[PDB]
C-alpha cells in the first residue's frame with residue numbers, strides 16, 4: 174500500500190491515520206512543483222490531477238480524495254475505531270464532517286496558497302478562513318471531538334487544517350476552543366510520529 | 375423525511391435521488407435571499423450555514439453536505455442500488471467521486487454564480503470549469519457511468535452540475551461525451567419529475 178504525500182500538505186491526515194491504525198504502508202513523498210515522486214517517477218501516472226494524497230492498494234488500484242482515503246484507512250482496522258461501524262447512522266455524520274472540511278474549509282485556504290493572487294483576493298480568502306474558524310471555534314467550545322464523541326478521521330482531518338492559518342498569518346489566539354481542541358490531538362503519538370516521518374518534528 | 379432545496383441549485387441532486395429510490399418525503403423550498411422556508415421557519419435554524427441541500431431524517435437529525443445526503447438516500451433503499459453496498463471497495467470509489475464533485479467541480483463554479491465577482495475572477499473560474507469539463511469528457515467518453523459500472527448517485531450529482539456551464543457562457547457542444555451522457559439521464563422519470571416540480575414558479 175502506497176500513500177503519496179507532500180510534507181505538511183492535506184496528505185498529512187491520511188498519514189496520521191495510517192499510523193494510528195498501524196497498518197503497513199510506505200509513504201512516498203512527491204515534489205508537487207515538478208509533479209514527480211521522490212524516487213523520480215511521474216506522479217501524473219498515479220493521479221492525473223497531480224494532487225496528494227493518493228492511495229495505491231496492493232491490487233494496483235489507486236484511490237484519491239481525503240474523505241474516501243480516510244474512511245478506507247479507518248475501515249481496514251475497525252479496532253482503531255477511527256470511524257463508526259459500517260451501516261451505523263453516526264457514519265453519515267462523519268461523512269458530512271469530512272465533506273464540509275474538504276469542500277468548504279479546505280477550499281477557503283486555496284487562494285492563500287496561490288502565487289498570483291490579488292491582494293483583495295487574498296484579503297477575501299483570509300476573511301473566509303476567519304469566518305470558518307469562528308464558526309468552528311463556537312461549534313467545538315467545550316467539546317473534544319468534531320464528529321460524535323469519539324476520536325475519528327474527521328478530528329485528524331480538521332487537526333491538520335487547523336495548522337494552516339498560523340501558516341497564512343492568521344493568529345489562532347482568537348479561537349481558544351480550537352487551540353485547546355488541536356492541542357489535545359497534537360499530543361497523540363501518531364501525530365508526532367507522522368510529523369517526524371515527514372521531517373516536520 | 376424533509377429535503378430543503380432551492381430550484382435548480384445543487385440541492386436538485388438529492389431531490390432526484392429521493393425520487394429514484396421511491397421514498398416518501400417532502401421538499402421544502404427555501405428562499406435563500408432571506409433564509410425562510412415555505413413553511414415559515416427561519417432556515418438558519420434548520421441549517422446554521424443557511425445552505426441547501428439539507429435533509430431532516432426520519433430519526434430526527436438534520437444532515438448536510440451532498441455526498442453524505444446522497445449516500446444516505448441511496449442506503450435507505452438497497453433494492454434501488456444507487457450506491458454500492460457497505461464493505462465493498464467499490465463504495466470508496468463512489469465516495470471519491472462524490473468528494474471530487476463536491477470539493478473540486480462544484481467549487482469551480484462558485485465565482486461564476488457570485489454577484490460581486492470581477493471579470494478577471496470570472497474568466498479564471500470559467501477556465502477552471504472548462505478544464506474540469508475537458509477532463510470529465512475524456513473520462514466519460516470511455517465508460518458509461520461516472521462511478522463504477524451502473525447508474526449511481528454520483529451520476530445524478532454530476533448530471534446536475536453539467537446543467538450549469540451553458541448558462542454561465544460555456545458551450546456544452548464542446549464536450550460531446552458529456553452531452554450524450556447527460557442526454558440519457560435527462561430522460562429518466564425521476565429526473566424529469568424533479569424538474570417538473572422545481573420548474574413551477
Ligand SMILES: *SC[C@H](NC(=O)CC[C@H](N)C(=O)O)C(=O)NCC(=O)O
Nearest residue numbers: 182183205224225226238239275477
Ligand atoms: S493539500 C495539497 C493539494 N491537494 C488537494 O487539494 C487535494 C484535494 C481533494 N479535494 C482531497 O484530497 O480531498 C495538492 O496536492 N495540490 C497540488 C499542488 O500542486 O499544489
Ligand SMILES: *SC[C@H](NC(=O)CC[C@H](N)C(=O)O)C(=O)NCC(=O)O
Nearest residue numbers: 276383384406425426427439440476
Ligand atoms: S448550490 C446552493 C448552495 N449550497 C452549497 O453550495 C452546498 C455546498 C456543500 N459543500 C454541499 O452540499 O456539498 C447554497 O445553498 N448557497 C446559499 C446561497 O445563499 O446561495
